[PDB]
Design a protein around this motif. Structure first.
Motif, PDB file in Angstrom:
ATOM      1  N   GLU C 163       0.825  -1.202   0.000  1.00  0.00           N
ATOM      2  CA  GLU C 163       0.000   0.000   0.000  1.00  0.00           C
ATOM      3  C   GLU C 163       0.862   1.255   0.000  1.00  0.00           C
ATOM      4  OE1 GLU C 163      -0.898   2.460   2.432  1.00  0.00           O
ATOM      5  OE2 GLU C 163      -2.338   3.295   0.998  1.00  0.00           O
ATOM      6  N   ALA C 164       1.940   1.252   0.785  1.00  0.00           N
ATOM      7  CA  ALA C 164       2.830   2.406   0.830  1.00  0.00           C
ATOM      8  C   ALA C 164       3.478   2.656  -0.523  1.00  0.00           C
ATOM      9  CB  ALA C 164       3.895   2.201   1.905  1.00  0.00           C
ATOM     10  N   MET C 165       3.961   1.599  -1.176  1.00  0.00           N
ATOM     11  CA  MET C 165       4.588   1.771  -2.480  1.00  0.00           C
ATOM     12  C   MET C 165       3.586   2.266  -3.510  1.00  0.00           C
ATOM     13  SD  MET C 165       7.470   1.687  -3.965  1.00  0.00           S
ATOM     14  CE  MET C 165       7.769   2.264  -5.633  1.00  0.00           C
ATOM     15  N   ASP C 166       2.358   1.746  -3.466  1.00  0.00           N
ATOM     16  CA  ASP C 166       1.337   2.220  -4.392  1.00  0.00           C
ATOM     17  C   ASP C 166       1.034   3.695  -4.171  1.00  0.00           C
ATOM     18  OD1 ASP C 166      -0.819   1.384  -6.456  1.00  0.00           O
ATOM     19  OD2 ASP C 166      -1.976   2.422  -4.905  1.00  0.00           O
ATOM     20  N   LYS C 167       0.936   4.121  -2.911  1.00  0.00           N
ATOM     21  CA  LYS C 167       0.560   5.504  -2.647  1.00  0.00           C
ATOM     22  C   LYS C 167       1.713   6.473  -2.884  1.00  0.00           C
ATOM     23  CE  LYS C 167      -0.334   6.138   1.876  1.00  0.00           C
ATOM     24  NZ  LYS C 167      -0.443   5.866   3.336  1.00  0.00           N
ATOM     25  N   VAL C 168       2.965   6.019  -2.758  1.00  0.00           N
ATOM     26  CA  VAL C 168       4.100   6.883  -3.082  1.00  0.00           C
ATOM     27  C   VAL C 168       4.396   6.918  -4.572  1.00  0.00           C
ATOM     28  CG1 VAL C 168       5.152   6.455  -0.833  1.00  0.00           C
ATOM     29  CG2 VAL C 168       5.878   5.124  -2.825  1.00  0.00           C
ATOM     30  N   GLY C 169       3.695   6.127  -5.377  1.00  0.00           N
ATOM     31  CA  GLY C 169       3.900   6.141  -6.809  1.00  0.00           C
ATOM     32  C   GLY C 169       5.095   5.313  -7.232  1.00  0.00           C
ATOM     33  N   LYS C 170       5.336   5.317  -8.545  1.00  0.00           N
ATOM     34  CA  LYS C 170       6.415   4.507  -9.102  1.00  0.00           C
ATOM     35  C   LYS C 170       7.788   5.035  -8.705  1.00  0.00           C
ATOM     36  CE  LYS C 170       7.481   4.842 -13.427  1.00  0.00           C
ATOM     37  NZ  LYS C 170       8.759   5.595 -13.299  1.00  0.00           N
ATOM     38  N   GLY C 373       5.945  13.140  -5.200  1.00  0.00           N
ATOM     39  CA  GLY C 373       5.120  12.383  -4.281  1.00  0.00           C
ATOM     40  C   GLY C 373       5.309  12.756  -2.827  1.00  0.00           C
ATOM     41  N   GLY C 374       5.439  11.741  -1.970  1.00  0.00           N
ATOM     42  CA  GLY C 374       5.639  11.962  -0.556  1.00  0.00           C
ATOM     43  C   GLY C 374       6.570  10.919   0.026  1.00  0.00           C
ATOM     44  N   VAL C 375       6.957  11.148   1.275  1.00  0.00           N
ATOM     45  CA  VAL C 375       7.897  10.277   1.968  1.00  0.00           C
ATOM     46  C   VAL C 375       7.119   9.260   2.787  1.00  0.00           C
ATOM     47  CG1 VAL C 375       9.842  10.173   3.550  1.00  0.00           C
ATOM     48  CG2 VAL C 375       9.567  12.148   2.036  1.00  0.00           C
ATOM     49  N   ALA C 376       7.482   7.989   2.643  1.00  0.00           N
ATOM     50  CA  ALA C 376       6.866   6.905   3.393  1.00  0.00           C
ATOM     51  C   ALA C 376       7.733   6.585   4.602  1.00  0.00           C
ATOM     52  CB  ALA C 376       6.693   5.665   2.517  1.00  0.00           C
ATOM     53  N   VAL C 377       7.119   6.572   5.782  1.00  0.00           N
ATOM     54  CA  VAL C 377       7.830   6.439   7.047  1.00  0.00           C
ATOM     55  C   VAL C 377       7.280   5.224   7.779  1.00  0.00           C
ATOM     56  CG1 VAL C 377       8.218   7.488   9.289  1.00  0.00           C
ATOM     57  CG2 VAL C 377       8.398   8.876   7.226  1.00  0.00           C
ATOM     58  N   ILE C 378       8.172   4.307   8.151  1.00  0.00           N
ATOM     59  CA  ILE C 378       7.803   3.017   8.722  1.00  0.00           C
ATOM     60  C   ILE C 378       8.402   2.906  10.116  1.00  0.00           C
ATOM     61  CG2 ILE C 378       7.972   0.528   8.523  1.00  0.00           C
ATOM     62  CD1 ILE C 378       6.089   1.788   6.551  1.00  0.00           C
ATOM     63  N   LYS C 379       7.552   2.632  11.097  1.00  0.00           N
ATOM     64  CA  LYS C 379       7.953   2.496  12.492  1.00  0.00           C
ATOM     65  C   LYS C 379       7.761   1.043  12.899  1.00  0.00           C
ATOM     66  CE  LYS C 379       5.852   5.743  12.001  1.00  0.00           C
ATOM     67  NZ  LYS C 379       5.533   6.458  10.744  1.00  0.00           N
ATOM     68  N   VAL C 380       8.862   0.307  12.989  1.00  0.00           N
ATOM     69  CA  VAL C 380       8.844  -1.086  13.412  1.00  0.00           C
ATOM     70  C   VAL C 380       9.271  -1.135  14.870  1.00  0.00           C
ATOM     71  CG1 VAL C 380       9.835  -3.370  13.082  1.00  0.00           C
ATOM     72  CG2 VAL C 380       9.286  -1.942  11.099  1.00  0.00           C
TER      73      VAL C 380
END
Lengths: 524, 524, 524
Positions: C163-170, C373-380
């Motif tokens: 989902e993150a990759m789809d929303k940040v575009g190609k 686009g935008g920056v995708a930020v992941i908190k594990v």
């Protein structure tokens, strides 16, 4: 490392083996059939050599006995290098033989000091014998022969030395340098020369490859860097109305004055060559005044009441042709009085010796030889730097030997003159039996070096030496042909200076060292 | 540093075994069937290499005897590598054969000096034979073939280098560089080139991809920086009158000047680009006038009272095209005097003889290539640094082989010329039978490299040697074809210089080593 | 230092010992039943790991022999990590098996060159066949499947990543880091944004956390030190007369500027947001130029030929809305056209395709995503620090794998593509018998990874491989559930680039095994 002391022969025996050690380290390299030894290099690759002293200089053994023995024998060989550098093997073998005969005499309980007295007074008698036996060495054929002996059958280097020495004269200076190719390069640089380059590259002259030439220029001396005054223009225009090229020697020229000084030279008004100070201040200036006297110039130092621009146009010195490149400036022939040149030579004659010796003497001699004649430069080439140096050391040895032969002449070589004067002086007598046996010991010890020389060819020393002793005069033995004949045929003639100095210094050191009786040493 | 003294046979066998261990360690790389050697590296991964001296330079033995032997022998290999870089294994093998034969002869009681003379004469004769049998190599097909064999049967590299040398001309410069991709790529850069970028990113001109190009511009050279020298306003007006682009070479430009210039260019007032000087002060001073000669301009000099303010219209350099990227500038068809180009080339020719050697050669040949030759870039594309090392090493091997062959000519490869000249020279005799024995034994043992070449293939060296001795002419065996035929068919050609240098150096060093009769070491 | 040389059998045995070390180090991690390894750390906590390079890069053993073997095999693992970073265990195992079989063949007397050429041909043919069989997959279901395959039965993370990759575009990228909450958190905000805290806390408006949201502000970006200038009174007054809020990005703020600005704040006349320069001078300046282009403003500073106190009110851009947090700033929408987007992205793209790669490109995608686009930020987040490290490593491996799959396409994962290419390429032929032998040995060794998988699973490896060799297509075995079935149902697919890179690395390591003949070590 605590000190431990021993007495007499118990220590002496230790000495012997160390002597024995160093002895066979050296005598294996003697003679044409003698071989070489390679010396380990801590930094780089080991270096081949044939000189015994070159081997021994760095040699010291683990134990204190042999180490100190090696040092105390190495000093005479160091002095031999300081003077000539060859005949070192002879000094070592005679020292070994005489110390063995000394232990033999001590076994008789015999006084070392009267032994030394008899021996060295006999040595002085042998000095007189050799001086009587000296013959002039004049022909370049003998020079070539002795060089070939020194150069291991190298006719090329020896003959080249011959014509170089002849054409530079007997007082002309000759120097040997490196070369890379298989062929040595012979250069003659006569007149006045110094190694300084032009600060401005625009001094590229009409000759191609930037070669610079000036015919009858005006040479001038200055002590200032011409920046503040910026006005040499009175002198410049005096030379312009003179209309002749010029060379200037000064502290420096600032870029502002340099611009017009180079710009104006293009313009064709006056050709001016500017150079940096060749060397250290006082002495370099002193030799510049000598050059000016040589070139017909006047003694000009700006550090006195006279001025750079306040002068007379005739103060400029003139030389027929000067050749200038990126680094070297040379004069072929100048305009000066030979009477004044010879007066300066007489003035510098005592300065040839002075008291500084090593540093002053050779530098001043080469400088004065340049002042009167020219220098010879020989680029000795070889495949490897070890090969270049191996030939080189023999080259300087042969150079010094040629100097000795020129200054003093030669004597009968091959040690036959030695054995003949020993036989003739066997009649010599001392104060008592101690001195008499000391003389006989010196004779019998002097016998040994020649016997070892014979042994070096893998032939019996005894009967060959007896046959050598049987004849006289021209009769002698050649190792290269291993046969008897005249000195002239074999060309084996000993230069007088090297033989005299080495033999007498070795005799002195041996006489003083056989006096050993007590030992101090350090613990591991 | 306690020293230990050894004599004769013991040191002889020590030297023997050390040289043998080093040599047969090297032998694993000889021939096409030779492999690589791995050398431990403390900093990181080990170094994997084929050429022997590369391994040798870091060789140090636990035993002092072998350590001395290795360091004393490595000089010849190191300097041979400095000369050519390949065939070093062959030189080492023949040197080992020479050592073996020399020690065997001395075991018989051989005269070392007779051996020296014999090997010297043999080397002289072999050099003359190689000179006589050397044949020119001109056709690009043979050049590609020798590159292919030199690149370990790599025809792609051969065609690449042939294309590069063709398009860079006879005097072009070819270099190999790191590549990013997975495969090698070769690029040709021609004309006046230097690595300097535009001062500001806003300098991007009409060409896309951020490129900065000008058609038919003029070139300005500023000796110093721009502080108030932005007063070229008159010249600017002339340029504004001319409607021409401009290029700037200056030490530095004011921020106000940079800003005002950028605005002028973007407003279309006058479109100008500026880049920095390429190199050091001396380099730039030498090469700016070279640029001017290429572009027909006059260099503005701060050393002379001619400046930007007082200048002429054609003082700007003239070129047909300029292309500038982020850090590189290229000039296409500068409008300058070709005869002045030859004058500068002749000046370079005079400057060829320089002690600086290769360090000088970089720029020395750089200027010639920019004028007449060309630039070749061989970007080695692969993954593992060891693989780039291998392919690169093959690259300079091929490059050196091609350069030497073009300048010098070729002989048959694989040592067929060696055995042929040995057979032809078996008839020479020297002064002494001792010397003759040395020469003939050298001839007998000089075929050993061929023996080992056969052995590396897992094939009978004796069978092949006997069959080749039966054969004549260019007939010989090849491992790549693993059968016999004509040596010319496979196009394996050797420059004469590499073989000559190897043989002469090996003979000289061997002759000096065998003469050693004493050994010295230090204990740990 | 002291060197010891090993040849042939002994060196090969030491290589075998290093191989054994490597094999027992790696085998523990193959497959689901291949388990994790704890990494001893004296500094901090020992770290749990599964990646082959992660296990490898830090392992060095005492025994020098296998030590240098490991050092020289470390390079392939390091390069693989720098290229792909996942499947490292698989590539390492296959390479080790190939090397083991090659060492066995050399023990049988195998020819290095036949191996070299045959392995080169096999690698090239396998690359071609793999490209031919490559099937790109674009459906998000397959993306989730492969991400879970990398994630070992983690579905939610794969869905979040997709989902993150789809929303940040190609072209938009995804950033992953640690988290506090034990559940992963995905945050994506589109448009232009960078994190920056305001110097004056009184910028806080009525909304919390100092977040201010403003309509059509006058956006100014200044690369020059704005502290010194302050002033801007005409522009400030023009904006105040306009009636819109104020936005300024300044290099620094003066105490006077601070005073007047805080007077503006507490007086309530105009809301002004002042922020400090983002980052590193030149690149921050470039990205500020990008921001100005995307906001429709004009790049104005002393680096631009504009004037400070003289300006036009329209020179600045306006935004749909600007949002400012305590330490970050975003713009909802600004004046940016798709044509300017294409131009800026292209002039950035040319820099993206360069050799700099690391430490510059990641910021390039950052800037480009901020452009488009935008920056995708992941908190594990989880419990134990070592386990967060392990999860981060696994998640980033999955991230890289997903990026490679998206940009390239995939083939059959789980190693079945390996068996299928081995099956289809049984028809390969070489130049001679030895080449074919080496090729067939490589083909046989291709079975090793899968049979090791089955062995770890506790099932019959060779028979399961044989059963797989009977069918074709996407039918094979599942190790997670441990039964046969089709690949498509569970979606075991792998990006093809890692496979090709592994094959190329295998080719290189084979080419560096063939030359293993002599090795050198240093013992105390």
């Amino acid at each position: 490392a605590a000190k431990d002391v021993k007495f007499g022969n118990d220590a002496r025996v230790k000495m012997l083996r160390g002597v024995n050690v160093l002895a066979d380290a050296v005598k294996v390299t003697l003679g044409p059939k003698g071989r070489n030894v390679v010396l380990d290099k801590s930094f780089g690759a080991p270096t081949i050599t044939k000189d015994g002293v070159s081997v021994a200089r760095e040699i010291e053994l683990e134990d204190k006995f042999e180490n100190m023995g090696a040092q105390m024998v190495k000093e005479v060989a160091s002095k031999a290098n300081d003077a000539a550098g060859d005949g070192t093997t002879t000094a070592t073998v005679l020292a070994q033989a005489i110390i063995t005969e000394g232990l033999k005499a001590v076994a008789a309980g015999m006084n070392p000091m009267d032994l030394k007295r008899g021996i060295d007074k006999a040595v002085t008698a042998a000095v007189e014998e050799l001086k009587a036996l000296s013959v002039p060495c004049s022909d370049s054929k003998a020079i070539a022969q002795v060089g070939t002996i020194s150069a291991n059958s190298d006719e090329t280097v020896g003959k080249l030395i011959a014509e170089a020495m002849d054409k530079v004269g007997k007082e002309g200076v000759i120097t040997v340098e490196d070369g890379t190719g298989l062929q040595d390069e012979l250069d003659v640089v006569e007149g006045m020369q110094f190694d300084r380059g032009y600060l401005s590259p625009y001094f590229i002259n009409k000759p191609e490859t930037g070669a610079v030439e000036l015919e009858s220029p005006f040479i001038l001396l200055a002590d200032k860097k011409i920046s503040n005054i910026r006005e040499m223009l009175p002198v410049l225009e005096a030379v312009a109305k003179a209309g002749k090229p010029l060379l200037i020697i000064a502290e420096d020229v600032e870029g502002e004055a340099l611009a017009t000084l180079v710009v104006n030279t293009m313009r064709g008004i006056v050709k001016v060559a500017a150079v940096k100070a060749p060397g250290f201040g006082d002495r370099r200036k002193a030799m510049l005044q000598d050059i000016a006297t040589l070139t017909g110039g006047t003694v000009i130092s700006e550090e006195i009441g006279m001025e750079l621009e306040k002068a007379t146009l005739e103060d400029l010195g003139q030389a027929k042709r000067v050749v200038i490149n990126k680094d070297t400036t040379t004069i072929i022939d100048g305009v000066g009085e030979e009477a004044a040149i010879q007066g300066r030579v007489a003035q510098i004659r005592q300065q040839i010796e002075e008291a500084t010796s090593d540093y002053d003497r050779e530098k001043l001699q080469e400088r004065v030889a340049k002042l009167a004649g020219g220098v010879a430069v020989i680029k000795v080439g070889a495949a490897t730097e070890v090969e270049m140096k191996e030939k080189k050391a023999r080259v300087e040895d042969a150079l010094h030997a040629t100097r000795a032969a020129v200054e003093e002449g030669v004597v009968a070589g091959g040690g036959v003159a030695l054995i003949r004067v020993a036989s003739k002086l066997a009649d010599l007598r001392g104060q008592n039996e101690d001195q008499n046996v000391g003389i006989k010991v010196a004779l019998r010890a002097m016998e040994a070096p020649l016997r070892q020389i014979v042994l070096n060819c893998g032939e019996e020393p005894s009967v060959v030496a007896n046959t050598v002793k049987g004849g006289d005069g021209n009769y002698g033995y050649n190792a290269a042909t291993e046969e008897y004949g005249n000195m002239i045929d074999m060309g084996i003639l000993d230069p007088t200076k090297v033989t005299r100095s080495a033999l007498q210094y070795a005799a002195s050191v041996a006489g003083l060292m056989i006096t050993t009786e007590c030992m101090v040493t350090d613990l591991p």
